[PDB]
Symmetry: C2
Subunit: 139 residues, 2 copies
């Protein structure tokens, strides 16, 4: 398809869980996603590390019960009022990310099933980020 | 800590699973990680999308049984002989990613628990990618 697009999704919460040292990563990741399953929460973005993982939820109705449950498998921190921006396009993804050079970015994900690049920013940086991505994607 | 580092991990396999339309994402993600738990496989990088997810394993001993099991919850494709590169450092991550402008990249992940940027490339592009990242990170 011959499509270029920029999309923003507001009202996002990011959750960071640093796994307990006691837990083997493969058990930790299953337990983690099982907690999100229980509360029927879709996750738009995920990024793992050696230490732990950050992921998003699109509503906070169940947030306290989710943090409570997660606090059993790791140390949990939360940042509210975030925004997911999705950019739909030979290094393309590098050029797009490079347009965000001047804006703080909390997460980046590329390689799921598409050529879409996903980025998470604070609400206060949404406009700056969208303007830079629109100018680059559509020039 | 006042540390800059570049690290490469060889012998990686990437698995792409496009979820069955029948399945709600939150159930799909738990089932998925539960299959990796059964086979005790750690996952260094993950990237989700609307359609489905891509993830890595560091050995292929259990690969056929994993694809077999996953084929029940989605359409599965696999690419072997990959390499994970980790770069440890106000837009820093954008500048680092921008050094890969000329190299094909299969995945990018940033935001797990660190300021580390993770990238997945084919074995044939390891040297080019490492040279570009070392020059940028260490100049």
């Amino acid at each position: 398809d011959c499509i270029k697009a920029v999309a923003a999704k507001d009202g996002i919460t990011v959750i960071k869980v640093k796994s307990s040292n006691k837990l083997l990563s493969w058990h930790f990741m299953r337990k983690l996603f099982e907690i999100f399953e229980f509360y029927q929460e879709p996750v738009d973005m995920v990024a793992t590390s050696e230490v732990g993982v950050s992921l998003t939820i699109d509503n906070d109705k169940n947030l306290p019960d989710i943090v409570r449950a997660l606090s059993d498998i790791g140390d949990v921190t939360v940042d509210k009022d975030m925004v997911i921006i999705c950019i739909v396009g030979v290094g393309f993804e590098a050029r797009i990310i490079n347009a965000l050079k001047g804006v703080p970015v909390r997460m980046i994900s590329y390689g799921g099933s598409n050529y879409n690049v996903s980025v998470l920013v604070k609400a206060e940086d949404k406009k700056k980020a969208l303007i830079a991505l629109s100018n680059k994607l559509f020039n």
